[PDB]
Amino acid sequence: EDLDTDNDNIPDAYEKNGYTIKDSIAVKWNDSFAEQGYKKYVSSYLESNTAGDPYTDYQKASGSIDKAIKLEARDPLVAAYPV
Amino acid sequence: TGTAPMYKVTPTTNLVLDGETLATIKAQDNQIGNNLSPNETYPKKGLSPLALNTMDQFNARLIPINYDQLKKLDSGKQIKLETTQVSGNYGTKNSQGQIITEGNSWSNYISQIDSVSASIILDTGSQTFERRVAAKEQGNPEDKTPEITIGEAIKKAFSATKNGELLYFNGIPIDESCVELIFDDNTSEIIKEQLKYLDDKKIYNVKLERGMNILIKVPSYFTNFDEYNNFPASWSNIDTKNQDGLQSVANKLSGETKIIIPMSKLKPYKRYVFSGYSKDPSTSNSITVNIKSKEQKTDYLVPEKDYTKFSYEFETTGKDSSDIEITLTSSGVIFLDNLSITELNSTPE
Amino acid sequence: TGTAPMYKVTPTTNLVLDGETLATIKAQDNQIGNNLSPNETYPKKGLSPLALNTMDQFNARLIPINYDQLKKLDSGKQIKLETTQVSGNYGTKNSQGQIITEGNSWSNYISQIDSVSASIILDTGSQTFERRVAAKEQGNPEDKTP
Ligand SMILES: [Ca+2]
Ligand SMILES: [Ca+2]
Ligand SMILES: [Ca+2]
């Protein structure tokens, strides 16, 4: 659970299964976390930018992106895209 | 109408008059918007629209037209504006901790985002939201993009709330049976095929694929006979003492039902769709559908064992015109639930 | 009316007459204010207002109006001015210890500040003060804003 192929700061096993961000650290998903308001995330372990936007999976999941971006784009599968 | 703000907005617009493009103008210093947050406008809501009256790079040359175009304008013809492309910047962080937008072009990512994603649009009647959801390549073994269903993609993209088996965007139910779904040919083709191999026939259970185009339209009028009924009039001959409904109760049609839709309650020269859900365990009865509108059409519907959706289109002409009538009659015993009226695109006058 | 000064103030203004926007003018070299401290004005209190009479990038083209607009003006109608956006810079420090404002755009932070803050305005009748106060996100467990 320490392999990071794409060097996107999230382990491959964490991306294949669910994962969440606590204290700016990616941790494995437990179901009980959903009761505290945490969201389950999945992304590609071979792509640093799964959605193809200028922000990586860890940047979107952790919230290190510009605060004017909607929270929907915090999911790695939802791209930050202005229309 | 996206998810991220745009900095230094520089749109390009075509001015078209009677099949000819008068000019193609790119925004300059006088027309560049510094900030444009999602669900916002430049200029803001309380301000007047900005003036585009120059065509050169330094805002020093006006936009000319010739004599024939001026005569066409004086004859009643109108100029249309189209948007061809928009330029802008996104924000990043540098080694000094300051936000940098210069040199961060959104055009460097537009093609890549459109190539690997599927487009989902939501139209609640007053607002519009556009989203891109990533999906994997069909034939690539090395693509590790996770697979989610259409409903899961919608919930992820629009931050909808799941209170059980219900989906709410901002208090408006966006369930599969409460909204109108529009696709193109390819999306319709994949969606209908996939369903023919599923225990459920719910489109929201269909796996999302790259290249899909989905449009969700919240209905102008909707009734489920439980708590919501916002039709301009009251439905005639309604049976509410039932428990065989799609969600809570149904409307067992024993006779003829008619509605009166005043023309003032509908937009003129627009195409509307009347939709509903029907069920008949006997699978023997038939329903007659008739709508008095700009043109009156008559159709016959054969229900199935379980609930199925029926939809029929009609048009309107003129604000001060005749009233709108819709009638539904069944020879035997049928069930009706989730009756809705939705507004499609505007037919030209 | 804020809390921080602005350097190289470059406002953008709409000129509106009877429901039509005559022009949208961005400030140029002749109309840029070097310094604008909070609770102060450019030009200062004892000086005359600055003249905006050019619409091009090099302050060489005047702002024109047509015959109908001139007739409307001569009939008693008045032109209104609206502010759509203001550009400016903030000050930082470099490795040499000198204050640097070039390349420090206030527009890079306007949306972020407005997104995570609440607006409080105070009007004492003669003056106005506008403030932004940070507050946490309602649903985020990882937001630690007090
Ligand atoms: Ca990884
Ligand atoms: Ca990744
Ligand atoms: Ca019902």
SS (H, E, C) B28-44: CHHHCEEEECCCCCCCC
What number of H helices and E strands is found in chain B?
Answer: 4, 21
**3 state SS of B211:** coil
Q: How far away, in angstroms, is B159 Cα from ligand 2 center?
A: 22
User: Per DSSP, which regions of C18-116 are E strands?
Assistant: 20-26, 33-36, 80-89, 92-93, 99-100
Answer for the pair A20, A62: CB distance below 8 angstroms, yes or no: no
Answer for the pair C8, C106: CB distance below 8 angstroms, yes or no: no
Residues 6+ apart with CB under 8 A from C144: C136
Q: Locate the chain B residue with the closest alpha carbon to A76.
A: B134
Provide the shortest C-alpha distance from residue B139 to chain A (in Å): 16
Name the residue facing C112 among A22, A36, A68 (closest C-beta): A68
Query: Which residues of A carry a binding-site annotation for Ca(2+)?
Result: 4, 6, 8, 10, 12, 15, 44, 47, 57
CA–CA distance, B99 with B153 (Å, rounded to integer): 31
Q: Give the tokens for residue B133.
A: 């959801």
CA–CA distance, C41 with C49 (Å, rounded to integer): 10
Run of H or E residues at B88: strand B80-89
Answer for the pair B28, B58: CB distance below 8 angstroms, yes or no: yes
DSSP classification of residue C109: H
Task: Tell me which residue has tokens 């006979």.
Answer: B225
Nearest 10 degrees: Cα torsion B297, B301, B306, B308: -30
Provide the shortest C-alpha distance from residue B24 to chain A (in Å): 20
Complete edge-to-edge strand list for the sheet that includes strand B213-217? B128-134, B117-123, B213-217, B180-183
CA–CA distance, B264 with A41 (Å, rounded to integer): 48
Provide the shortest C-alpha distance from residue C72 to chain B (in Å): 19
Task: Tell me which residue has tokens 């407005």.
Answer: C114
Amino acid at A49: N
Task: Tell me which residue has tokens 């039902």.
Answer: B257
- For residue C111, the chain A residues in CB contact (below 8 A) are 66, 68
Residue whose C-alpha is closest to residue B202's, from B296, B280, B308: B308
Residue whose C-alpha is closest to residue B223's, from B88, B340, B347: B340
Q: Which of C109, C142, C145 to mutate to test the interface with A (most CBs of A within 10 A)?
A: C142
Answer for the pair B44, B32: CB distance below 8 angstroms, yes or no: no
In this structure, what are the phi and psi dihedrals at residue A60, rounded to the nearest 5 degrees? -70, -45
Residue whose C-alpha is closest to residue B280's, from B259, B298, B301, B299: B301
CA–CA distance, B276 with B202 (Å, rounded to integer): 16
CA–CA distance, B342 with B125 (Å, rounded to integer): 9
CA–CA distance, A77 with A19 (Å, rounded to integer): 13
Q: Which of A19, A66, A67, A75 to mutate to test the interface with C (most CBs of C within 10 A)?
A: A67
Residue whose C-alpha is closest to residue B263's, from B275, B250, B272: B272
Answer for the pair B238, B257: CB distance below 8 angstroms, yes or no: yes
End-to-end CA distance of chain B: 28
Using omega within 30 degrees of 0 as the cis cutoff, is the peptide bond preceding B262 cis?
no
In this structure, what are the phi and psi dihedrals at residue B305, rounded to the nearest 5 degrees? -65, -40
Answer for the pair B3, A79: CB distance below 8 angstroms, yes or no: yes
Residue A66 has a CB neighbour count (10 Å cut-off) of 22
Answer for the pair C40, C110: CB distance below 8 angstroms, yes or no: no
Q: Using the beta-carbon criterion (under 8 Å), do A50 and B156 form an inter-chain contact?
A: no
Cα distances (angstroms) measured from residue B290 to each of B250, B265, B273 = 21, 19, 13
**Adjacent-strand bridge partners of B119:** B132, B213
Amino acid at B319: K
Q: Give the tokens for residue A13.
A: 């096993």
**CB-side neighbour CA atoms (13 Å) of B149:** 13
Please report the residues numbered 104 through 143 in chain C whose beta carbons come closer than 8 angstroms to any beta carbon of chain A: 111-112, 114-116, 137, 139-142
The chains found to touch B (3+ Cβ pairs under 8 angstroms) are A, C
CA–CA distance, A15 with C64 (Å, rounded to integer): 61
Helix boundaries (H) for B80-215:
107-116, 150-158, 185-195
Q: Residue B151, exposed/middle/buried by CB under 10 A (0-12, 13-18, 19+)?
A: buried
Q: Using the beta-carbon criterion (under 8 Å), do A69 and B145 form an inter-chain contact?
A: no
CA–CA distance, A2 with A14 (Å, rounded to integer): 9
Q: How far away, in angstroms, is B233 Cα from ligand 3 center?
A: 19
Residue C129 has a CB neighbour count (10 Å cut-off) of 14
What is the C-alpha R_g of chain B?
Answer: 25
Answer for the pair B99, B5: CB distance below 8 angstroms, yes or no: no
Beta-strand relationship, B167-168 and B161-162: antiparallel
Total count of residues recorded for chain A: 83
CA–CA distance, B12 with B1 (Å, rounded to integer): 18
DSSP classification of residue B158: H
Total count of residues recorded for chain C: 146
Residues 6+ apart with CB under 8 A from B212: B118, B119, B135, B183, B186, B187, B190
**Adjacent-strand bridge partners of B260:** B325
- Where residue C28 falls (left for φ over 0; alpha for ψ -120 to 50; beta otherwise) is beta
Residues 6+ apart with CB under 8 A from B187: B211, B212, B213, B214
Answer for the pair B250, B308: CB distance below 8 angstroms, yes or no: no
Run of H or E residues at A57: helix A57-62
Q: How far away, in angstroms, is B45 Cα from ligand 2 center?
A: 39
Run of H or E residues at B71: helix B67-74
Helix boundaries (H) for B203-297:
none
Cα distances (angstroms) measured from residue B12 to each of A82, B15, B24, B27, B36 = 16, 10, 7, 6, 16
User: Per DSSP, which regions of B90-157 are E strands?
Assistant: 92-93, 99-100, 117-123, 128-134
Residue A13 has a CB neighbour count (10 Å cut-off) of 14
Q: Using the beta-carbon criterion (under 8 Å), do B132 and A70 form an inter-chain contact?
A: no
What is the C-alpha R_g of chain C?
Answer: 20
Run of H or E residues at B261: strand B256-261
Provide the shortest C-alpha distance from residue C113 to chain A (in Å): 8
Answer for the pair A32, A23: CB distance below 8 angstroms, yes or no: no
Q: How far is CA B160 from the centre of its chain?
A: 17
Residue B261 has a CB neighbour count (10 Å cut-off) of 22
Answer for the pair C115, C140: CB distance below 8 angstroms, yes or no: no
Answer for the pair B229, B223: CB distance below 8 angstroms, yes or no: yes
CA–CA distance, C54 with C2 (Å, rounded to integer): 28
Answer for the pair B281, B325: CB distance below 8 angstroms, yes or no: no
Name the residue facing C115 among A23, A37, A68 (closest C-beta): A68
Closest listed ligand to the CA of B238: 3
Residue B341 has a CB neighbour count (10 Å cut-off) of 25
Cα distances (angstroms) measured from residue C38 to each of B133, C4, C32, C42, C124 = 45, 6, 17, 11, 16
